[PDB]
Design a binder for this molecule. Structure first.
Ligand code: COB
Length: 237
């Protein structure tokens, strides 16, 4: 426990001022729930951190990043900003092997490198509401995608990445259960309908009363990735 606290402190020093939160978990908790194809090739007790962004990340990280020399063409600036800050975590721990995987990363075969929502659930960060959490569901033969809900921000947050520390083993790290903050069947059905079929209206994110939401400015930003900035100027050309 004291080892993970020292590491968690350094990561938080690096990331929390920029509107991220960080949660430890053991690789085993993640691999446990998953078929072989998605397993991370590390010992079960390997230490990991799940990194998410709060509503404050837009102002504290993204807006400054847009003025930095680090800004490049052809990738969404939010993803650049996230890669940049995860990269800082590497630098803050120069004597350790550190692996970082962002939420947007995919293998050539288009499978995600990390299942962000599964990591968020087992790290205790946000309960991952899935079709399987609704008995006698009303949905038929079609994809119903699951959605995590943060106890403080509702759905006004995003999962940004995972930090792995191969060679740091923490077999005694105790699981912290995510808060079941949308407990009833009817509320879970409404959440999932809202996420899968009406997400552009933002309403699913209010499944629990948020401490803070994205500002209208931030809502205006997330208007649609290819159009939204770099193929922006599009409305001017
Ligand atoms: C099969 C599988 C595919 N899942 C994936 O491939 C998700 C990848 C990815 C990149 C997300 C980030 C990531 N790296 O994870 C992201 N999207 Co997508 C941009 N999304 C998409 C893709 C559809 C694919 C889909 N959602 O899966 C879309 C382009 C349509 C897409 C759409 C959205 N997506 C959206 C967003 C917000 C997100 N999207 C996510 C899921 C993510 C996490 C990205 C993020 N950054 O935060 C967002 C959700 C945040 C939140 N949970 O609150 C959104 C709203 C558009 C947006 N504004 O950006 C929109 C919502 C509609 C929709 N999800 O259908 C994509 C692909 C993703 O995962 P699975 O969880 O369903 O099954 C899995 C399974 C694998 O075999 O085992 C696990 N398991 C089994 N038993 C148990 C468990 C797990 C636990 C915890 C148990 C207790 C038990 C578990 O059930």
């Amino acid at each position: 426990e004291p080892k993970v606290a020292e590491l968690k402190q350094k990561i938080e020093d690096t990331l929390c001022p920029f509107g991220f939160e960080v949660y430890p978990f053991q690789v085993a908790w993640y691999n446990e729930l998953l078929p072989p194809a998605f397993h991370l090739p590390l010992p079960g007790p390997t230490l990991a951190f799940l990194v998410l962004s709060t509503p404050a990340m837009f102002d504290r990280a993204l807006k400054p990043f847009l003025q930095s020399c680090h800004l490049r063409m052809l990738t969404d600036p939010v993803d650049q900003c996230v890669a940049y800050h995860l990269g800082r975590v590497r630098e803050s721990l120069p004597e350790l092997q550190i692996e970082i995987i962002a939420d947007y990363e995919v293998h050539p075969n288009r499978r995600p490198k990390i299942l962000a929502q599964t990591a968020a659930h087992v790290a205790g960060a946000a309960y991952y509401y899935q079709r399987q959490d609704v008995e006698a569901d009303p949905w038929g033969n079609q994809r119903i995608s699951g959605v995590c809900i943060h106890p403080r921000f509702g759905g006004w947050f995003a999962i940004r990445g995972v930090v792995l520390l191969p060679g740091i083993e923490v077999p005694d790290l105790p699981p912290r259960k995510p808060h079941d903050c949308v407990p009833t069947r009817a509320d879970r059905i409404a959440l999932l309908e809202g996420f899968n079929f009406h997400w552009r209206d933002w309403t699913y994110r209010d499944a629990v009363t948020p401490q803070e939401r994205y500002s209208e400015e931030q809502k205006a930003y997330f208007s649609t990735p290819p159009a939204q900035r770099l193929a922006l100027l599009g409305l001017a050309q």
